[PDB]
From a paper:
However, we could not detect any density attributable to the NTD. We, therefore, performed focused 3D classification on each CCT subunit. This analysis resolved an extended helical density that can be attributed to helix 3 (H3) of the NTD of PhLP2A adopting two different orientations associated with either the apical domain of CCT3 or CCT4. Notably, only the apical domains of CCT3 and CCT4 were predicted to form a dimeric complex with H3 of PhLP2A with good prediction scores, in agreement with our cryoEM density maps. The NTD of PhLP2A can adopt two different orientations, whereby H3 of the NTD contacts the apical regions of either CCT3 or CCT4. While the NTD is mostly negatively charged, H3 has a unique positively charged patch (residue 75–78), which displays a high degree of complementary to the negatively charged apical domains of CCT3 and CCT4 (Fig. 2a(i, ii), b). The charged H3 residues in PhLP2A that contact CCT4 are also highly conserved. In the open state, the PhLP2A NTD adopts an H3 extended conformation to apical domains either CCT3 or 4.
Residue numbers in the entry:
A (entry chain D): 26 to 533
B (entry chain Q): 66 to 232
Amino acid sequence: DRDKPAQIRFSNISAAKAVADAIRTSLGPKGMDKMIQDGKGDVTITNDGATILKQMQVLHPAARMLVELSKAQDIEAGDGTTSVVIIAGSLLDSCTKLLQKGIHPTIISESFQKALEKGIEILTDMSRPVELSDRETLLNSATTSLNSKVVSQYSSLLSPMSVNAVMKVIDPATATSVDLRDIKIVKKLGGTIDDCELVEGLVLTQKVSNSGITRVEKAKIGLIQFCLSAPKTDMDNQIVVSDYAQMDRVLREERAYILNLVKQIKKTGCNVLLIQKSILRDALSDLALHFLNKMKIMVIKDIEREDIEFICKTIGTKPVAHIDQFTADMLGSAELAEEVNLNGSGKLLKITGCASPGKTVTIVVRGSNKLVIEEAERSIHDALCVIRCLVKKRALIAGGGAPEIELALRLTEYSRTLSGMESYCVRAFADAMEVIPSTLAENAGLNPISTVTELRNRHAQGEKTAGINVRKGGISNILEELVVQPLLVSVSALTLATETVRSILKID
Amino acid sequence: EDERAIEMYRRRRLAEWKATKLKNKFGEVLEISGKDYVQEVTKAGEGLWVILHLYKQGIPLCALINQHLSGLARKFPDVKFIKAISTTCIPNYPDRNLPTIFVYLEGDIKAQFIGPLVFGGMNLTRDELEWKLSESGAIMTDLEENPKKPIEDVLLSSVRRSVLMKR
C-alpha cells in the first residue's frame, strides 16, 4: 500500500533529520561547545561530530545507516565526516517535498544519477592540478597543506612531524600501498621533544633480565608463544601435608620437568627467547632463568598481540606455540642489540634487522613531559593520513564555499537547459547543494543571506572568486588566505552521499 | 663454583615454596549484598559470631551507627561484620522500621533490635553500644553497670530516704 511506506519513510526521515541537527552546529573551525552527560555521573566538552555520533545511538536502522556512512567517510578520506551528513540531510529534506509532489522513486533515482554525473564533471573541471613526482613537488605540496592545516604554532616550532614522518615513511615508495601497520609507532616518557629519530628496524621497550652482560649479535632470538610454568597439581594440597613424605617425591619430578624442557629448546641456537603475556601461565619459573644464565641468556617477556603480528611481519620468523614443533621457521638474521636510556628515560632497544629487506620503519617520541607523549602523539597519525591520501589524487581545490555555490549555479543552468520531467529534480538538487557557506557565516557570526547572494553573484561573474575568510570575517580569495584541500575528499563525499540517498529512497 | 651455584636451587626452590602453607584470621568490615545471606546460617563457620545491619538513606541516625561498628571491629578481630541495603530483603517492612542487627551464632537470631526508641536516639556512644552487647567476647571493659543512671523523678525517692535513715 501507500500508508505503511509513507509512514515508515516519514519516520526514517524524522530520525535522520534529528540525528543530523544534533551535531549540525559544529562544522568548521568555529564549532561551538557542547556538553553531553552519559547518565553515569560524567560530563564531557568537545566539538567534533565523529566521536559524539559514535558514543550514542538510537535502536533504529536509519541511525545505523548514517553511523556507517560517517565511519566509511572517515576511513576513506579522514576528514569532512560532519559535512557528509549535512549534505545527506539536505537531500532528505528536499526529497520529502519532492515525493510530496508525487514522483516515482525510479525517476528521482535516475535524475539524481544524471545530476551526479554532471556535478562530478563540473568539480573535476573546476579544480586545478599539481605535481607529485619528486621530493620537491611533494615537499611544497606538504608545505601548502601545513599552512592550510590547523594552526601550526607548535608544529612550525617543534616539528616532530614536518620531516620525521614524511621522510621516514617515504621508503615503501610504491603508489597506494602504505598500510598503517607499516608505521607502528612507539612512545616513551622522559627526555625532550627536541629529537624523534629513525631506525630501519623494530624497537622494543621493556625490562630484559639481570645477569652479567647482554650485548651481542647472532641469529635471531626466536619467537615463542610458549608457557614454562608446570601445570598446577590436581589438588590444592597433596595427599598428606607434612615434611616426611611429599618432599622426597615431588622434588625430582619438578627438577626434571623444569630442566628437560630448556634442555630440549637448547637444541636450536642463540640461547635467547621472547614470550607472550602471562594471563593464564601462573607462577613463572626462576630456576629456568638461573639455568639460562649458565646458557648465555638474553630475553624479553610479555609481548603483545598487535606486536606479535607486526614483528612476525618485520623479521620473517613464523611463530611457535609449543616445544614439539621446532623444525624450521624459527630464526632470522640480526645485527646488534642493547640500546640504553640515553640522555633520558623510557628504556628501549634498537634491533636493526636487515633480514627481510621488505620496507618497514618506526617512530619514537621521547620528551621532558608526559604531556609531550600527549601533545606530539597522533598528530603524525593524522598528517600521515593526509600525506597518504595525496599519493593518488595529485589535485587540490580551494575552500571557502566557492565550489558549493559554483556547482549550484552550474546545476541550476543544467536544470534550465534539460527541460523535462527531470529538470525540477535536478533543480532541487542544485538548491539543496548550497547550504554550507551560510552555516560558516553563522559559525563566524554574520547575516548569511546577503553574503551568500553576493558570493553567488561574484561566481556568476567569474566562476572562480573569493571564498570565506575566517580571519577577518570578510570575502577574500583563498589564493592569499591559503586554505586548500585535495579533490577526493569532496568527490568521494558527493558520490557516496548520492549513492546512499538513492539506496535509502529506493527501499520501501 | 657450579655446586654452590647450582645447589642454591634447593636453597631457593622448596624454600619460597616452604612458605606456601597459609592460614588466616579476620579484620575490618566487608560490604555484602544479599547474594550470600541465604546459606549464611551454614556459611557461619565454627563459633564465628557475626553481626548484621540494615540500611536506609536520609536518616540522621542511620549514618551514625554505621561508623561505630567499623570502629569496634578494629578492637575485636575474631568477630566479623556486614553492611546491607533493605531493598535486597522484604520490600515494605524496612521503610517504616529502623536498623535491626540480627546477630547469628551460626543459628537462630538472638537479639533483634527494631525501631529507633530502643537505641536511645543519637545519645549513643561506644559505651551504650558495647554493654548492650554483653554476649560476644567476655571483656566489656569490666563495667558493672552504666545506664547513664536514667535521670530521676524527684517525688519517689523522698519517702525512701526517710524510712531507711530513720528506721
